A paper describes a structure:
In Gram-negative bacteria, the biogenesis of β-barrel outer membrane proteins is mediated by the β-barrel assembly machinery ([name]). The composition of [name] varies by species with only [name], an OMP itself, being fully conserved across all Gram-negative bacteria. Structures of [name] solved by X-ray crystallography and cryo-electron microscopy (cryoEM) show that [name]-E interact with [name] along its periplasmic POTRA domains and that the complex is overall conformationally dynamic. The full extent of this lateral opening was observed in the structures of fully assembled [name] where the barrel domain of [name] was observed in both inward-open and outward-open states.
To investigate the mechanism [name] uses for OMP biogenesis further, we used in vitro assays to fold the MBP-[name] substrate into [name]-inserted nanodiscs for structural analysis. CryoEM studies were then performed where we observed a mix of particles with and without MBP-[name] in our 3D sorting, with one 3D class having noticeably larger nanodisc density indicating the presence of the MBP-[name] substrate. The final refined maps had a resolution of 7 Å, revealing not only larger nanodisc density, but the presence of a triangular shaped membrane domain, rather than the oval shape we have observed previously. The [name] structure was then refined against this density map which showed a widening of the barrel domain of [name]. Guided by the refined [name] structure and the available density remaining, we found we could accommodate at most four strands from [name]. The C-terminal region of the barrel domain of [name], which includes the conserved loop 6 (L6) and its interaction with the opposite wall, appears to swing out as a rigid body to accommodate the extra density within the barrel. We also observed additional density in this reconstruction extending down from the modeled four [name] strands to underneath the barrel domain, indicating that the pathway by which the MBP-[name] substrate associates with [name] during biogenesis is from under the barrel domain of [name].
Author numbering:
A (entry chain C): 25 to 90
B (entry chain E): 20 to 110
C (entry chain A): 24 to 810
D (entry chain D): 20 to 243
E (entry chain G): 1192 to 1232, 1255 to 1300
F (entry chain B): 20 to 392
The structure:
């Protein structure tokens, strides 16, 4: 081909796919709660600045020399 | 509204709760939430912002704009006590 | 012994970390030989290849295991027309490929599963081998060589213990047949244990229905000829005594539902006993349980059967299945047609009452709808409470529909080009995908169609489409009628009463029509619309701009398809035209299929195909003459020419028709016909009424399955169609048809048989069209065009 | 499965794998996987096959070789009780999930897709949870720290679509439970807030207005 | 002197084997389409007769031989080839 | 033809090379009732009573002939008597045990009845239950018959007169394999499928011993070929036959315990001529090892998938015709043809006879062609 439909470095979707809209907190008012941490929940805490998107690469995880 | 002549809406409307006088009978104050759970199978609706107080209903008439509303709101607190029974079975 | 050496050997490609995990007791643990053997068979639990050599000389744990061709780097070859893809996919089911070190018992179970496959099929002349010649250095070379025989080519099906019921009778009640005489050529032979079971079931159930309630299921088997095929089917049974269904008794765990059910349970006592009665009588009541809503009940129809008294009392006692539960409908796929489109295509919903009935309705609903090839309705279990059951269903998509190129017969026309692109399941998102571009030389049609029958409401259908064809075929000059016909229409269906729908079609058509013939009908219309056609040339032209509506409604009381048994196809259709239309006129068309066999044996069967069409022009702007049904041909009257009955093609004379095509067009052509030529076969008149009688009965020279697939039709059915709007001044020497007597005489017999792959309708009718309006032919032949 | 004809004469794993690295930097992942598998067939031995399989994985995804990718996955994790690359694999394996992505074509308008397969989403979720917990150190570590929450929000959008179907179908009764299910999932995803007015109106239809107003003022103060 | 000979009754539940599978496959199918009424008036024929082959899943191609006769226009031999790819 | 000519599975077949007509087989008796049968599988031996060549058809037709050019004495199409529709299709299963003035027959319809030999018309009638597989065994008036499904009946030559029913063992799936129920020293002894042999009482069917021997389909699903047919040969009250797959013990009537073995060849037909026996196996070659240890001095493997009938070592000539209409004489030892008639395409299912040395054959067509060579 010579027009489109390729994938070599552009991360599928986009960087908006990398992140579109962050979370936001709500606050269940007095005498009223909500058990939410029920399921897939490992607290995501990164200090960064781990490569992301075009910065992120998945090159073969080889050894120094072979 | 009008008589039986306007835009017709008669497919099958579908809502299911085969509620009977068993429900009326098996219940007193301080009911055992788990035993009444099995007596009722599925606990449909609890207060997310409060105690259980399970909320059931029968809103069903197939087709025509008519429908039921036969609710089963039943107090369920801590210590497994039903202090109150709640039903507006009327439209 | 003190385990001091983590000592793993052979170390070909092993996860030695996983190996250290494989030993429960780790090194430096002074343990007994009990723990030693524990660790040993724990390493055996690796189950990939374990060539154990456990040595205890000092404190080193000399546990050596040697690698081998045990890598399963296999190959594959040497096979017959057996389904190779099934072979490979089941190897994948076992995962046997490169890696998965090897296992003599695993390759053995592969080979033997294939062998027992042969067995169950009976193809089963096993020449079976999984040749494992290992490529050097642990590698493998495999050859799957399997020369087999053919399946059970049905030999004798000898029936044992039969009496009072001829063998061939219940045979016909069964599936298995092994006959290809001069009689038929469609007989084939095969095997299935399940065929055997089901045939037994049909047999003894039938007997119950004969009141032979008691039955003796004897060990019926089949001897198999060695050293070749051969299948001698010992039908070893015993019918058991005849009885009458004397009573029906209920004592089942319920609450008042007893009386709620007896009305069904209630039957006339002392009936000749019937097992199908038992069936229906438990089916309806399970359905009523559903109409109340539970899990599914125990149903014991204990038959109190007494001999010499023929008694079948029915202690039919039923304890309802467990109570109402909720459920988790989850369907995977989720392509261009997102899940919701199916969520609505299934008549069932979480939150409301559950039931295998509703989910079943969803099953068949998706089935006959289809966007796929499977309806994998799989219910599962949520722990804690016996409810919110996991009903997670799968479909195997039937996507990427018709890519079509119809190329047909130039050399009279141009080579007919047709591009058919119907990629529903692709933009079958909720829509229709219809792309029809065809043209031979002069018959240039285009269909662009898209339909969400559910537009914002499942009921709300949306079919938008352009249908444009131009007929450009001509043979003369100043007489060359040409039709370009654009039509843009949107349709909106509305059943909310099931099998009861009205459909609103709102459409415009532009229709440029040139060089119209001297036909007195079209000329009547020209003068109606005020046009004064050229009384010399077939030359006039008009552009037909008609915006219009049509209401098409149908009721459907049907009982079965492929063979129609009870049919109620009730089809009204009325086209109405607005002043925006160039003419003001209204077509009414009535279509009635009314089919009932009074005989449940289907030998006294009354059927009616009845049809009517009437045009209502507002005068001067009437029913554009072509706006007419087709009377004749084979619509329902056959051996004729359609839209030729009634009116006769009278062409007002045009000897000025500008190069008569050398009698490729006549009747008021240049070399054509003089003062108005009363040629035959004009469009059927304003009013058409036709009625059709049908009946069937099997002949005593066939099998029952043929009757299940064949349809003998008897008919002397005389329609009549006439132009209500008629003049006799011009039709003075010519006939006059505003005439409710346009009768035929078609003493007709026909036959429509459908092979499992195609239907065929062939007829002989001795015709006497009272009013002729047609050609008389005796050979009304065609094969059913399954749409 | 087993293909990629070895039309090349068998040669030492080192030089053929050097050709593999040549195609690696060349991008002809088809023939690259071809020669890598050709090696491991001609060499079901050797720790050289470790890197051979790593490059197999990389050229799989750079070539969109999905079932081959899963084969690499399970075979290696059988060979991998642990490895210097597992979190890579972990991200890769979560990557594997999104590998079921492509369905259509858009250049200026766009079509929706966030109402589809949840299982691989949850799988990648687990993948990257295990990554960040076992590997709170990688480019993949941080990219997954954010990837997890992104795909959880995408799940929120999915569940919105699901709920709203029954709602518009009048089948609110199930969504009544479904909204508290989303709560047991998330209140904090914007999609949750987006849906809350719908469940409030449902409440009102079914006369739980007494809590419809609650959730309404919750989306007022709590949310925007 | 001790006594621990049997003094017990254990109970458990398991499952030995489960293996089960079934095969299936087709080879082709054909759909022929034909129609002919005689004339049977001057005598000749007039028909539109063809076919279509239904291969396992994907290949579908149809023939039609048609003909109109006894008219001032006459379709002599309308051989019509088509294909369908609903793979 | 090359289209329905290259689409089927095949294994192999010989040409039967080197036809040797050292003798000159002349069918000095040449007669045919036609049907007979054409393809099926059962024992349907016609009978004879002092040259009376009883003829028949697979329709309850009870015909006759005598040692002639073939000349009938009577023909009585006694298919049924008052069945469903007046002589229904009455196929046959079980040869004709003409004893006394009682022609003896039985049909898969479980119909059994004596016939006056002078007319083949009923001498007595006792219709039975179970598919009448075997032929009547009018053994000292103890007319013992087993029907295919593993149930046996004891009758009397008087009018049937059921004596004791033996609903004996059967495989999981009924299949081929029939046994010799002969009785010696007053012992109802019989072979059996399932690698099993039974010795019971010829007054009650009461077992004295039952021996299970070797294997077949079922957990070792031997697929499709000539295993061992379970009809033995017994001498001195000692049973001799292969086990069920070619393992030839000896089993004494009183004991039935395993004697000397010959684990060789899943042969089906076999006649003993003074402790000499012969092998044909699964492609119809001959390596005719005798029970005298390993005496294969009778081997003629010129037949590959050439189905055959029971051998006849008469006039010292090793003689038997195949099941393809061809006729074969053999050296007294191995084994080239002292004669051979590659003649018919008949096919054969029941047992012909060489009585008086006359080749009393029952061919599917050319039924009774007895030959002199």
């Amino acid at each position: 081909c010579s027009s489109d439909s390729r994938y070599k470095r552009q991360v599928s979707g986009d960087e908006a796919y990398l992140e579109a809209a962050p979370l936001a907190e709500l606050h269940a008012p007095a005498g009223m709660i909500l058990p939410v941490t029920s399921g897939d929940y490992a607290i995501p805490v990164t200090n960064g600045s781990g490569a992301v998107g075009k910065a992120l690469d998945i090159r073969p995880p080889a050894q120094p020399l072979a | 509204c009008s008589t039986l002549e306007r835009v017709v809406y008669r497919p099958d409307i579908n809502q299911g709760n085969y509620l009977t006088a068993n429900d009326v009978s098996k219940i007193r104050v301080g009911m055992t939430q788990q035993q009444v759970a099995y007596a009722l199978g599925t606990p449909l609706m609890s207060d997310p912002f409060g105690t259980n107080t399970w909320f059931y209903v029968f809103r069903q008439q197939p087709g025509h704009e008519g429908v039921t509303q036969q609710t089963l709101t039943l107090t369920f607190n801590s210590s497994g006590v039903l202090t109150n029974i709640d039903n507006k079975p009327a439209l | 012994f003190v385990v001091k050496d983590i000592h793993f050997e052979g170390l070909q490609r092993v996860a030695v970390g996983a190996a250290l995990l494989s030993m429960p007791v780790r090194t430096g643990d002074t343990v007994n030989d009990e723990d030693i053997s524990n660790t040993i068979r724990a390493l055996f639990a690796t189950g990939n290849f374990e060539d154990v050599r456990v040595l205890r000389d000092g404190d080193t744990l000399l546990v050596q295991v040697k690698e081998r061709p045990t890598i399963a780097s296999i190959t594959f070859s040497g096979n017959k027309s057996v389904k190779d893809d099934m072979l490979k996919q089941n190897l994948e089911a076992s995962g046997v490929r490169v890696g998965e070190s090897l296992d003599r018992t695993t390759i053995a179970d592969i080979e033997k599963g294939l062998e027992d496959f042969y067995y169950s099929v009976g193809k089963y002349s096993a020449s079976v081998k999984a040749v494992v010649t290992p490529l050097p250095r642990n590698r493998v070379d495999l050859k799957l060589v399997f020369q087999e025989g053919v399946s059970a080519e049905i030999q004798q099906i000898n029936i044992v213990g039969n009496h009072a019921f001829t063998t061939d009778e219940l045979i016909s009640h069964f599936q298995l047949r092994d006959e290809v005489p001069w009689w038929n050529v469609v007989g084939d032979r095969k095997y299935q244990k399940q065929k055997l079971a089901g045939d037994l079931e049909t047999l003894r159930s039938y007997y119950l229905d004969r009141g032979y309630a008691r039955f003796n299921i004897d060990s019926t088997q089949v001897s198999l000829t060695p050293d070749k095929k051969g299948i001698y089917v010992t039908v070893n049974i015993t019918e058991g005594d005849q009885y009458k269904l004397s009573g029906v008794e209920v004592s089942g765990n319920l609450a008042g539902h007893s009386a709620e059910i007896e009305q069904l349970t209630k039957i006339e006592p002392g009936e000749l006993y019937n097992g199908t009665k038992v069936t229906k009588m438990e089916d309806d009541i399970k359905k009523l349980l559903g109409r109340y809503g539970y899990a599914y009940p125990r149903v014991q129809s204990m038959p109190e059967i007494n001999d010499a008294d023929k008694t079948v009392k029915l202690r039919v006692n039923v304890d309802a299945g467990n109570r109402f539960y909720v459920r988790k409908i989850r369907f995977e796929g989720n392509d261009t047609s997102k899940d919701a489109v199916l969520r609505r295509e299934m008549r069932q919903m979480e939150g409301a009452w559950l039931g295998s009935d509703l989910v079943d309705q969803g099953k068949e609903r998706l089935n006959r709808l289809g966007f796929f090839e499977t309806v994998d309705t799989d219910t599962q279990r949520v722990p804690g409470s016996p409810d919110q059951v996991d009903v997670v269903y799968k479909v195997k998509e039937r996507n990427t529909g018709s890519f079509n190129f119809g190329i047909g017969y130039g050399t009279e026309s141009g080579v007919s080009f047709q591009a058919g692109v119907q990629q529903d399941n692709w933009l079958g998102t909720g829509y229709a995908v219809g792309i029809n571009g065809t043209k031979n030389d002069y018959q240039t049609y285009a269909e662009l169609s898209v339909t969400n029958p559910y537009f914002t409401v499942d009921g709300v259908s949306l079919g938008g489409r352009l249908f444009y064809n131009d007929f450009q075929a001509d043979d003369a000059d100043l007489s060359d009628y040409t039709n370009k016909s654009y039509g843009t229409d949107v349709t909106l269906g509305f059943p909310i009463n099931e099998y009861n729908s009205l459909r609103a079609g709102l459409g415009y058509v532009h229709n440029s029509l040139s060089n119209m013939q001297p036909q007195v009908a079209m000329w009547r219309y020209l003068y109606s619309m005020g046009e004064h056609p050229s009384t010399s040339d077939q030359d006039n032209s008009f552009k037909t701009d008609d915006f219009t509506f049509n209401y098409g409604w149908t009721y459907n009381k049907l009982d079965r398809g492929y063979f129609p048994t009870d049919g109620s196809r009730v089809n009204l259709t009325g086209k109405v035209t607005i002043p925006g239309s160039d003419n003001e006129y209204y077509k009414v068309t009535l279509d009635t299929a009314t089919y009932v066999p009074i005989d449940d044996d289907h030998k006294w069967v009354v059927l009616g195909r009845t049809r009517w069409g009437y045009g209502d022009g507002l005068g001067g702007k009437e029913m554009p003459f072509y706006e007419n049904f087709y009377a004749g041909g084979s619509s329902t009257v056959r051996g004729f020419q359609s839209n030729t009955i009634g009116p006769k093609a009278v062409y007002f004379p045009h000897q000025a028709s500008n190069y008569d095509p050398d009698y490729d067009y006549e009747c008021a052509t240049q070399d054509g016909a003089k003062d108005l030529c009363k040629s035959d076969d004009a469009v059927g008149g304003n009013a058409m009424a036709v009625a059709s009688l049908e009946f069937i009965t099997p002949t005593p020279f066939i099998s029952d399955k043929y009757a299940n697939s064949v349809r003998t039709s008897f008919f002397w059915d005389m329609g009549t169609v006439w132009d209500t709007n008629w003049d006799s001044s011009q039709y003075s020497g010519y006939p006059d048809y505003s005439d409710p007597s346009n009768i035929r005489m078609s003493a007709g017999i026909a036959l429509q048989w459908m092979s499992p792959l195609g239907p065929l309708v062939f007829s002989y009718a001795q015709p006497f069209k009272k009013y002729d309006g047609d050609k008389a032919e005796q050979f009304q032949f065609n094969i059913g065009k399954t749409w | 499965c087993s293909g990629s004809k070895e039309e090349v004469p068998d040669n030492p794993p080192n030089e053929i794998y050097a050709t593999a690295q040549q195609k690696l930097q060349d991008g002809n992942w088809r023939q690259a996987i071809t020669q890598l598998e050709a090696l491991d067939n001609r060499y079901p031995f050797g720790p050289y096959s470790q890197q051979v399989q790593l490059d197999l994985i990389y050229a799989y995804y750079k070539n969109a070789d999905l079932p081959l990718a899963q084969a690499a996955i399970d075979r290696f994790i059988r060979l991998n009780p642990t490895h210097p690359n597992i979190d890579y694999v972990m991200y890769m394996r979560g990557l594997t999930n999104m590998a079921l992505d492509d369905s259509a074509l858009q250049g200026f308008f766009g079509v929706d897709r966030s109402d589809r397969d949840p299982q691989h989403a949850r799988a990648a979720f687990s993948d990257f949870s295990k990554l960040v917990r076992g590997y709170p150190n990688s480019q993949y570590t941080t990219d997954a720290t954010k990837r997890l929450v992104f795909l959880k929000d995408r799940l929120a959008k999915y569940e919105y679509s699901v709920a709203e179907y029954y709602t518009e179908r009048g089948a609110w009764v199930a969504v009544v439970n479904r909204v508290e299910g989303m709560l047991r999932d998330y209140p904090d995803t914007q999609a949750t807030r987006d849906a809350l007015p719908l469940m409030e109106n449902a409440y009102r239809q079914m006369q739980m207005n007494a809590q419809a107003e609650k959730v309404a003022k919750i989306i007022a103060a709590n949310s925007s | 002197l001790s006594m621990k000979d049997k003094d017990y009754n254990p109970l458990i539940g398991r499952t030995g084997v489960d293996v089960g599978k079934s095969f299936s496959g087709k080879d082709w199918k054909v759909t022929a389409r034909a129609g002919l009424g005689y004339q049977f008036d001057d005598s000749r024929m007039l028909m539109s007769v063809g076919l279509n082959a239904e291969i396992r899943d994907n290949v579908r191609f149809g023939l039609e031989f048609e003909k109109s006769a006894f008219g001032k226009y006459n379709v002599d031999n309308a051989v019509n080839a088509n294909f369908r790819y609903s793979f | 033809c090359s289209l329905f000519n290259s689409e089927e599975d095949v294994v192999k077949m010989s040409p039967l090379p080197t036809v040797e007509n050292q003798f000159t087989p002349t069918t000095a008796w040449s007669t045919s009732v036609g049907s007979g049968i054409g393809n099926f599988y059962s024992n349907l031996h016609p009978a004879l009573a002092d040259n009376v060549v009883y003829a028949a058809d697979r329709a309850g037709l009870v015909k006759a002939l005598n040692a002639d050019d073939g000349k009938e004495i009577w023909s009585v199409s006694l298919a049924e008597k008052d069945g469903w529709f007046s002589k229904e299709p009455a196929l046959l299963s079980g040869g004709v045990t003409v004893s006394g003035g009682h022609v003896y027959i039985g049909s898969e319809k479980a119909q059994v009845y004596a016939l006056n030999t002078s007319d083949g018309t009923v001498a007595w009638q006792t219709k039975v239950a179970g598919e009448a597989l075997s032929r009547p065994v009018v053994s000292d008036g103890l007319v013992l018959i087993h029907t295919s499904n593993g149930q046996l009946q004891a009758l009397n030559e008087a009018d049937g007169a059921v004596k004791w029913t033996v609903n004996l063992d059967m495989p999981s799936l009924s299949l081929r394999g029939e046994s010799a129920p002969t009785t010696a020293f007053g012992a109802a002894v019989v072979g059996g499928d399932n690698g099993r042999v039974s010795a019971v009482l010829m007054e009650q069917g009461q077992m004295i011993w039952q021996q299970r021997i070797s294997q077949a389909t079922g957990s070792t699903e031997i697929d499709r070929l000539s295993d061992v047919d379970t009809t033995p040969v017994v001498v001195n009250g000692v049973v001799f036959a292969l086990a069920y797959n070619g393992n030839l013990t000896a089993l004494d009537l009183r004991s039935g315990q395993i004697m000397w073995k010959r684990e060789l060849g899943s042969v089906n037909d076999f006649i003993v001529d003074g402790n000499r026996i012969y092998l044909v196996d699964q492609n119809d070659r001959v390596m005719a090892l005798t029970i005298d240890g390993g005496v294969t001095l009778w081997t003629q493997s010129d037949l590959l998938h050439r189905l055959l009938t029971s051998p006849v070592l008469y006039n010292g000539n090793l003689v038997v015709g195949d099941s393809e209409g061809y006729l074969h004489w053999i050296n007294v030892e191995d084994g080239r043809f002292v004669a051979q008639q590659k003649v018919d395409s008949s096919g054969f299912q029941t047992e012909p006879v060489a009585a008086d040395g006359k080749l009393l054959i029952q061919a599917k067509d050319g039924t009774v062609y007895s030959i002199t060579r």
